[PDB]
Write a protein that binds this ligand. Structure first.
Ligand code: NAD
Ligand code: NAD
Ligand code: NAD
Ligand code: NAD
Lengths: 241, 241, 241, 241
């Protein structure tokens, strides 16, 4: 049961984060959608009812993230779960022979900044807020769930920046779970294959449905012994160049 | 929901398999406990009621496994789910200086035979039975779940035979999911850390509870996009020598 | 330098084991080719000269492997390096549609027996012989090198038996290095992609040359800090179903 | 043989990079040490003789890196090998409860900038220079070796920023090898355990010697089929929290 838990979901105005908010609110939880101001955040939070609110913030900004977390804790009293779905992608080769073009340093830095530095920024600030909760009967104070990708393991031609950012999330999953063990905060990462959001797959032979990602997030929230691990959700695909 | 599904659970008279049967029968499924004749399978199946029966069989025998699957079908009409939990262990070094003793070939063989060959024997025979089912709305005919171990990744001193056996389960998970993709049978492996069955864990700091392994099996049966993957269930532990 | 070292190479009459023997004998080492009686062992050993002999033995037999190691120690005085290249393969689906044929238990059993049980049998017996050597200046008494495959990570359709046998070699690499640490024996595993022995590779775009596997074996023998690890040698290929 | 090859080595004034330059120049290659102005680069380059020069540059600056690569090409004629060893480390928890301290965003950003963004900056600019070379007989134009760490797989308490930076190097290794396949440039990554540079390990039981990392670099340069892979060099250690 997720009934009564309070969750903050980055990238909550669209695709995987939105579908995660719809499932948890439908099971009795409260959700805060953290997304940029020009998104559809406000009207999705209105459609979802009085137990879902919108908080505008860019995940690379310390000040905007801090204000969104303060808002959640005042509206709902505490924070129990955080899910990181905010992210961007590009498709640019390291070096393109035919156009004789070199990947810019600025396009690499931008993808690292939103995807990897932005996910650590949310984790570092939300951990101190969860630390304020009273431990449940098993010593737990919170759960943090991150979104990597199968490109951390089989990155394709044109994915060097994206793959570097997602491999960085995979790499920090264990040390962050070991750091937060003493205060009872579990840290788990999901790595999606190809999903239908804004025939290579063995079975089922189709794009993933965002509601299948949401079901896996609920399982992770409910199981108390899952921690410091990365789980592939991809219909058994292995990516080719 | 697992309501109305039919599941065969090897090693179902004790520990992880028994706890899995309790959970699935309590959610409305039917369960067949496949375990050795001298186990307590019969009285555990009686305690769970009319939707749980016992089928005595050794997983290394072709004839006994076939007769157990024929019984399940005769009684319940079909097979939807199979869970492999039957397994044994030894603690013997490859070579022990102190007593000048080499590990015997016979003790390695026995562990491989029960753990790895017995798991493939159940997989090959149950696939033909699941292949008889009409596909659901998503093209699925069944789900097979195996039990490996964190020893497939950090085997300790004395675990060479056990690690070989569980490393073989990990290695065959993807080729078996690729083989059974055309008929809609998913194949997923769970790798448990230390569990309380017949100080080192980061969080929670205790042995796992068998009911936590059962909850993970139920969520693997429910999520349609999880396939060809291995999932660690271990409290974030990493084993030392 | 491998000059003067004594090596036993299983599967030495052909392909990767033969090419390994040619390189090491070329650099001043002595080699013993362990392979079945019906192979070309004897004439390859004669072509390579007086520092290369043939010892007929099936790796699944305790008695014949023991006799081959006794011959090597008798003839050359000691054993410093062991290389496991003996192996077989099959292409059989777990359950085959068009012919309605289930994978036999006997075909799975035979691949496991030669590839995984036969590699452990050589390891266990050669460790005691290496243990007889006086330690060098860095405390080392020997080095054991095994041959797995990229099929341990991306097994294809029809590779379930082979993948299981090679995943078991990967799984036991670390516990066996941990077991043999106290007497100074290093244990490393190589995982080849596709080699030219009896267009999908990124670069170089061709099958591997057996002489490239032999160069990597020499590098492993010479580097003192490489231990308990698996190395892919494959042109950056990742296998599709 | 590396005789005649021209290598650019970042972080070449100290530790792993310096030992690598010593070995390669000793075998007849030419080396360019790329390191910061405050280092001892100039006097190490002078001690090694006329086939070793110093080029002051910060890897985070594309103007300084471009000027260093231009100096190497004009002085020696071409660039055949690039080794990335430049790197820094910090030991700071994500959150510390007793002192109520949150990891700063700036300290995480700094480590990502030098270790991950600086390595991609060197890779993107050196690739175009290697592309100018005439392909050898096997179609190769160059080789790029990166330095990650065992902290990409077992990060400890306090290593969240360092682990994220090294996990990013691991994750981009395959997409960069796939990108550069068409022009014959191999891309491989080494992951060192604990080394004696400016108790525990199974065997040998000691810190690694920088000369052992240099020997592995040479073998990666000489083997033509090693590509898109990560190799652990750590005495079989597995890191605890
Ligand atoms: N759809 C797929 O196939 C897929 C596959 C693998 C991984 N992913 C990952 O899943 C996550 C969700 O992606 P999605 O498919 O739902 O995409 P999406 O575009 O539909 O949703 C991502 C949301 O993140 C928000 N966002 C972007 N930059 C932000 C910033 N700086 N601050 C705050 N919000 C920001 C966007 O505005 C958007 O609403 C991402 O991390 C993505 O990399 C998606
Ligand atoms: N408990 C742990 O810490 C742990 C950790 C990792 C992996 N595992 C694995 O979990 C699985 C279940 O283990 P467990 O802890 O419940 O042990 P358990 O002893 O309680 O149960 C295992 C059951 O398997 C049955 N079994 C054994 N050999 C059999 C055979 N040849 N044919 C049929 N049934 C047979 C036994 O009779 C027993 O009832 C095993 O595969 C074990 O290797 C357990
Ligand atoms: N060639 C490839 O593409 C490739 C790729 C990956 C892994 N491998 C592995 O490389 C190893 C060598 O294979 P190869 O390509 O050189 O094949 P090969 O057929 O040319 O040589 C293998 C040798 O092992 C011997 N052998 C077989 N069964 C034996 C037994 N019971 N006892 C003793 N010797 C026995 C054979 O007689 C043969 O001489 C095998 O383990 C194989 O699985 C090969
Ligand atoms: N020593 C170990 O135990 C160890 C273990 C794992 C990985 N590593 C990695 O090995 C590599 C070599 O480290 P080391 O142990 O030899 O350390 P070191 O400090 O001895 O040498 C690294 C060098 O990098 C240079 N450097 C730092 N920042 C730079 C920048 N912005 N631009 C250019 N040069 C810069 C420094 O001036 C120094 O000379 C690093 O990437 C490190 O993370 C080391």
């Amino acid at each position: 049961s997720v009934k009564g838990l309070v969750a903050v979901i980055t990238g909550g105005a669209s695709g995987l984060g939105l579908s995660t908010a719809k499932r948890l609110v439908g099971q009795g939880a409260t959700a805060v959608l953290l997304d940029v101001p020009n998104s559809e955040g406000e009207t999705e939070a209105k459609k979802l009812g009085g137990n879902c609110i919108f908080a505008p913030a860019n995940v690379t900004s310390e000040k905007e993230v801090q204000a969104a977390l303060t808002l959640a804790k005042e509206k709902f009293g505490r924070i129990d779960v955080a899910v990181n779905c905010a992210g961007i992608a590009v498709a640019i080769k390291t070096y393109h022979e035919k156009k004789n073009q070199v990947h810019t340093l600025e396009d690499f830095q931008r993808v690292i900044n939103v995807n990897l530095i932005g996910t650590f920024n949310v984790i570092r600030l939300v951990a101190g807020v969860m630390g304020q909760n009273e431990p449940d009967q098993g010593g737990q104070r919170g759960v943090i769930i991150n979104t990597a990708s199968v490109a951390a393991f089989e990155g394709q031609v044109g994915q060097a920046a994206y793959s570097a950012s997602k491999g960085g999330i995979v790499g920090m999953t264990l040390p962050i779970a070991r750091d937060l063990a003493p205060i009872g905060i579990r840290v788990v990462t999901i790595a999606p294959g190809l999903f239908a959001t804004p025939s290579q797959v063995p079975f089922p032979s189709r794009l993933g449905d965002p509601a299948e990602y949401a079901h896996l997030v609920q399982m992770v929230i409910e199981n108390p012994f899952l921690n410091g691990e990365v789980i592939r959700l991809d219909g058994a695909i292995r990516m080719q160049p």
